[PDB]
Design a binder for this molecule. Sequence first.
Ligand code: NAD
Ligand code: NAD
Ligand code: NAD
Ligand code: NAD
Ligand code: GSH
Ligand code: GSH
Ligand code: GSH
Ligand code: GSH
Lengths: 334, 334, 333, 333
Amino acid sequence: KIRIGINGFGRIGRLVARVVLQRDDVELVAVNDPFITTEYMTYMFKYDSVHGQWKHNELKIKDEKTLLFGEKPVTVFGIRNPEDIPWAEAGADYVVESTGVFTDKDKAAAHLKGGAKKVVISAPSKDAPMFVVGVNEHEYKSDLDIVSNASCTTNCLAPLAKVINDRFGIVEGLMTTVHSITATQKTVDGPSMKDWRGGRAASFNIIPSSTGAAKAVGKVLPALNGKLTGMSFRVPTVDVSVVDLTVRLEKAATYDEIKKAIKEESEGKLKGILGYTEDDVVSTDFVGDNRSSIFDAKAGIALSDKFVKLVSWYDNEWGYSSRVVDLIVHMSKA
Amino acid sequence: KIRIGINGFGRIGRLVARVVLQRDDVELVAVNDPFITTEYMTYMFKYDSVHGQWKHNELKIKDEKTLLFGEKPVTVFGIRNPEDIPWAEAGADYVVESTGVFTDKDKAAAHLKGGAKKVVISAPSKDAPMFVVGVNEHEYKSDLDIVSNASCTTNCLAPLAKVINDRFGIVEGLMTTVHSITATQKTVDGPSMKDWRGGRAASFNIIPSSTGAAKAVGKVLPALNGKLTGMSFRVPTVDVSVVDLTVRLEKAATYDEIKKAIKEESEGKLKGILGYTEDDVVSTDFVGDNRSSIFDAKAGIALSDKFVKLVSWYDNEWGYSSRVVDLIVHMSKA
Amino acid sequence: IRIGINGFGRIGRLVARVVLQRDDVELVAVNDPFITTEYMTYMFKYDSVHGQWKHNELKIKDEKTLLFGEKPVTVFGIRNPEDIPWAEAGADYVVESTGVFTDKDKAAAHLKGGAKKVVISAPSKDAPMFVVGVNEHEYKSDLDIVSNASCTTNCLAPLAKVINDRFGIVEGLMTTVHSITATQKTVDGPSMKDWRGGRAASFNIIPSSTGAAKAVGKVLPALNGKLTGMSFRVPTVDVSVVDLTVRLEKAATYDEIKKAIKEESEGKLKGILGYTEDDVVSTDFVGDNRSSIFDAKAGIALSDKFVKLVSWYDNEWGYSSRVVDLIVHMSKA
Amino acid sequence: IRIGINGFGRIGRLVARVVLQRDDVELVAVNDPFITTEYMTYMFKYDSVHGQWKHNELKIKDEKTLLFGEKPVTVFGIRNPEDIPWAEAGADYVVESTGVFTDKDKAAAHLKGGAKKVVISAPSKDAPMFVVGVNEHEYKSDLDIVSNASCTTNCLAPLAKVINDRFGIVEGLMTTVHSITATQKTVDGPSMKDWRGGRAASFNIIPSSTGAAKAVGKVLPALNGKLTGMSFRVPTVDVSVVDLTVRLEKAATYDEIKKAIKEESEGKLKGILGYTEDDVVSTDFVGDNRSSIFDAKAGIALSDKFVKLVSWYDNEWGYSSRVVDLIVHMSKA
Ligand SMILES: NC(=O)c1ccc[n+]([C@@H]2O[C@H](COP(=O)([O-])OP(=O)(O)OC[C@H]3O[C@@H](n4cnc5c(N)ncnc54)[C@H](O)[C@@H]3O)[C@@H](O)[C@H]2O)c1
Ligand SMILES: NC(=O)c1ccc[n+]([C@@H]2O[C@H](COP(=O)([O-])OP(=O)(O)OC[C@H]3O[C@@H](n4cnc5c(N)ncnc54)[C@H](O)[C@@H]3O)[C@@H](O)[C@H]2O)c1
Ligand SMILES: NC(=O)c1ccc[n+]([C@@H]2O[C@H](COP(=O)([O-])OP(=O)(O)OC[C@H]3O[C@@H](n4cnc5c(N)ncnc54)[C@H](O)[C@@H]3O)[C@@H](O)[C@H]2O)c1
Ligand SMILES: NC(=O)c1ccc[n+]([C@@H]2O[C@H](COP(=O)([O-])OP(=O)(O)OC[C@H]3O[C@@H](n4cnc5c(N)ncnc54)[C@H](O)[C@@H]3O)[C@@H](O)[C@H]2O)c1
Ligand SMILES: *SC[C@H](NC(=O)CC[C@@H](N)C(=O)O)C(=O)NCC(=O)O
Ligand SMILES: *SC[C@H](NC(=O)CC[C@@H](N)C(=O)O)C(=O)NCC(=O)O
Ligand SMILES: *SC[C@H](NC(=O)CC[C@@H](N)C(=O)O)C(=O)NCC(=O)O
Ligand SMILES: *SC[C@H](NC(=O)CC[C@@H](N)C(=O)O)C(=O)NCC(=O)O
């Protein structure tokens, strides 16, 4: 039923491929990467430095056109531009924009001319519609040709911000995210003309960089629009990131009260999306965590009973790619 | 004139030794480390994985009692407990408490029975007097038997917090410090019974841990006492750390205004202690920076003109050990 | 078979993972004076390399027992060994994983704890050495106390045995590129026993020591004095590789060497010596429970008598799997 | 002597540091299409390994010149080489540091730029290869375009020359434990030319390729076909080590080998081959400008004809020092 093809077998592309491969509501029809060879795709999928080897399927058949995942056959495209890929000729309703270069509303629209019914954008986009599963996936409508699943950081922030606002209200908030390094960085000092500090050696530097993660938590949560901002800090970890959010509350609460409220919501409307822990966890403890956001109770601290600092964890790779397929199923139905 | 002996040839002990070795107002009389051998001390001093090889002096003479720094002779003690070291019998007025185990007011008092006129504690202490050069070293008085130079994080926060408060006033602030790993951490998962997350592998984890850095910025800046708190994040860097401070201001300002005020103070009463940069700097750019705190203009962001997030850098090893000898000279004179 | 672990370190905890998941064996007690029994729950549960645990073990009583499912495991905080009452909770086989008691007589303290047999989680100067799959068969059940050698020995010895057994090695020099361990330092600090071992582990290529190459002969008397080597510690959490440089008595071609190692991979050395022709990397062997895996594509030969062979081992996982494989071989008389 | 650099990368910028601080040479122009001339100021000024610069170089005019003190350096953003007017700002000697133009004919594009001589910041398939201190003397001033070989070659060849020159090496196998470079990846990504090179560089021991061992013979025809080897990339910013395994024609003892290398250290190989008996570590060679330094204490011999020798090199700094050492040797006819 839900036939899928992925555009760009990157970090997110391969990992959301793993997610859809071990589910029964979802299927994998095609993959497009002009840079990866069909024999190379098997190696890239099988071996992972973060999430480990794959326990099910894996094999390539045809000279250079079809791979065998188990006995499900997946189609491979090495096509540079998006409209030139015949997304229908292998059945692909939902295309994952996992490439990172075609982010914008019009730029993902390129897939519909390949014969694709809908496309979901990995990254946030300047104009394409933005949804964070569990906080506003419900304002999706089926006229929508093209969609965006926002960012890892948005997906961790917005569920956590929403319960705080929805039971105590946020007046103003400032966020930092200390974030693992990604494919856009460099091993050693090199050119990254659009972010100068992004060119510096990723694994041996604490890199200040920017993410819009916060104001977007209003572009999808319009109640909090223009109420938050932040920055980032890229630091030498392969995967897993944490959000440090500092907000003042209109309605006074105690740290135990906000803790108990987050536990409440963790087992309610937000179960499996926003989690709760009171353990002495660290970075590694969330590799493979398929939740958008988990709440580090012990980490955070309160100054007033209206001014508090909240800590929450997210696997920027795994949990986010779980969320993209969670979104695709919601639009299937709705 | 200013004769010095250091207790504990650790990271800070050796580095403040380098600082005093290349100054003319200061001298090096003795070093005590029960764990380091006088031949081993030369190796540990000469070769440094962070700050590099040493350009001046270095040689050991006596079988196992005296080292030759240039032609200045330094005395070496391998004594377990503090009062059992004859601090006078080599002329030592000022003893650096660089050990980390004798932090408390009474526990550093142990050096005076060795015949030492004054002792300065590297770390912050529960009761010993606390001074951050450039913000309250002047409230030092010469009755003081024993003193503490506070923490790296305090030394970066308090100068930066003081100009913000002193020209706009801080109502409430929450701070995070993303901090390099230190000697108290473990290479791989091991026992650290007093901080559980501190036992996790330092170089491959983002470790939430606590530092009191903020409320102390009142124990030495009583105008801001009980007005700030924070947490830490230990991440896989050898050296250099940054403070992310989030405060609301009673008196409204614009980001350019606060930038210009920090530049003003950078060249005034705080010159050489609190610095100013508008460059796309990264972690490595402050190794060997001898300032307590440098202000990252471009990094930070403002939400309101009364609610702002400020970013400032500090070399937790080098700048802090520069500050300990800066403090010792102030107490020499005062 | 009842097993108790001394020192819930890296090797101790991971040997606990092994024995808790296999069914021919069970875990009776653990002793660590530096860890509190609740702290063992946290440290066992959470692992930066091998991940969270997918079964369950919890605390029952204030300081004395944990329950994995519903089985005891009594917890000791005893500083020195002859004071550990391995009989009083009935622990027949003891893992000496502390690293401080390598010597035969110093680990003998467990027999006075009322423990019938002792396995050293390390090489020892004066304890019989066995590398499962190459000499585990020379154990005798009179021998009270023993050593399973080192990770590096357990990786080298199968490969050395196969290479010598089919072509004969004249002389060998070995290098291992090795992950950092608990004995290294976060930052430059005192390590008087290894001066380069005190240097910041994660920012350095640190030259270090290994006995493993000399050790091969102590369990493979055919090559005694025919190998020696060195180590290089590098900033990785886990997984290490052996770089072996050998002169061959019998000339062979690299592809022939590949098929010989493949043969033994598939045959009696299965699960001890593996074989791959993949573009493997260190990460690809986290959780690999083999003693040694052979990186075919990596290695190179200069002549048909002079060749360099590359092989992988997870210093944590594979060695601990070998530890309880050895213990069960010793059960079987 | 006027020098211009093509590609302000790691090697390009650091060769710029060298030529800007020495006085027998000067720096005339730089070309990089991916860097804007203000961006060169930022990237040259700030370095994660070698630190900030202690002199000064700034921008003068919108895109065309920088001033180090008050000397020009004109800046080019030209994609392909024959379009770089090395004559029009008068740059006689060109550093080809881009890494894409190794081939003799492809770097010949600078002679059409009006440049009299070209030095390849790398090995090349079809360009004469020189390792300063071992064969720099065979340059002829008719040869228009050239290569300085690789960091690994420049470290191995002095040590191989000394060892062979006094004891003769029969066969050699080499390993290098090497820092990561710009060609590796932050996270697992496409590198179809080296499949293991795309894997996350900083979390892996990555087996990789080297021609340096075969290359030694191309500049040391005595040992042609007597050495070969492999590499291991490990998560460090800079500094690498060679692990050399040799068979000796003339039997020697390790201490004798130590004093022979010490002799050459002190003598004609001074500043190219260094010698230490210290507990050195990788960090200790950041900024070390020698081709090769000999870690005496590290290495080990099996017999007096079979020995393993360890030597250090800063792949960035020492190689770039060698680059302009070569250029000035070529000035001198
Ligand atoms: N990496 C993360 O943790 C993460 C998390 C959430 C969202 N995102 C977003 O997802 C997008 C991709 O992220 P990533 O980390 O996977 O980057 P990546 O580099 O790992 O993936 C990019 C992949 O796309 C392929 N590709 C490049 N050009 C292509 C094209 N023209 N057509 C088809 N494929 C092409 C490349 O081969 C590469 O495999 C980015 O926009 C990023 O912001 C990333
Ligand atoms: N490391 C930093 O960046 C930093 C910065 C500011 C303040 N501090 C504080 O300074 C203190 C030391 O810090 P560090 O990083 O140098 O730790 P460290 O481990 O590097 O130094 C401790 C040194 O003290 C020696 N020592 C141990 N016991 C001793 C004793 N009984 N008598 C004499 N010497 C003994 C050890 O040999 C070791 O060399 C700590 O309290 C720390 O909080 C550290
Ligand atoms: N780490 C490896 O990759 C590896 C692999 C194979 C073998 N080994 C060997 O195993 C031994 C332990 O290695 P590790 O990495 O687990 O070290 P580790 O530091 O992680 O473990 C040592 C543990 O023993 C405990 N301990 C100390 N004294 C004790 C006492 N007297 N009684 C009970 N417990 C005590 C400590 O609390 C610590 O938890 C070493 O000899 C090492 O050489 C290590
Ligand atoms: N990195 C090392 O430790 C090292 C050491 C010795 C030799 N080398 C060799 O030197 C060469 C470069 O190495 P690197 O580490 O500096 O790589 P790098 O990526 O740091 O440098 C390449 C630079 O060349 C520039 N460039 C690309 N195309 C260009 C063009 N056509 N014209 C002008 N500039 C262009 C790029 O912008 C980049 O800045 C490689 O061949 C490498 O093998 C590297
Ligand atoms: S993980 C989601 C991802 N965002 C980022 O990695 C940017 C993170 C930023 N704050 C930083 O530098 O740390 C994403 O969805 N991509 C959007 C983008 O930045 O292009
Ligand atoms: S660098 C000054 C040092 N403080 C710390 O390293 C603790 C930092 C903490 N926030 C963290 O875990 O990141 C110091 O002066 N020592 C005091 C101490 O913590 O003992
Ligand atoms: S990992 C097994 C361990 N041996 C080592 O620590 C040596 C690692 C070697 N390759 C190196 O130096 O890097 C062990 O069982 N303990 C050995 C011992 O000290 O008894
Ligand atoms: S560092 C010099 C560089 N050579 C290498 O990249 C090889 C490094 C080797 N030890 C390894 O693989 O790790 C170079 O000058 N370029 C070589 C080339 O491709 O031409």
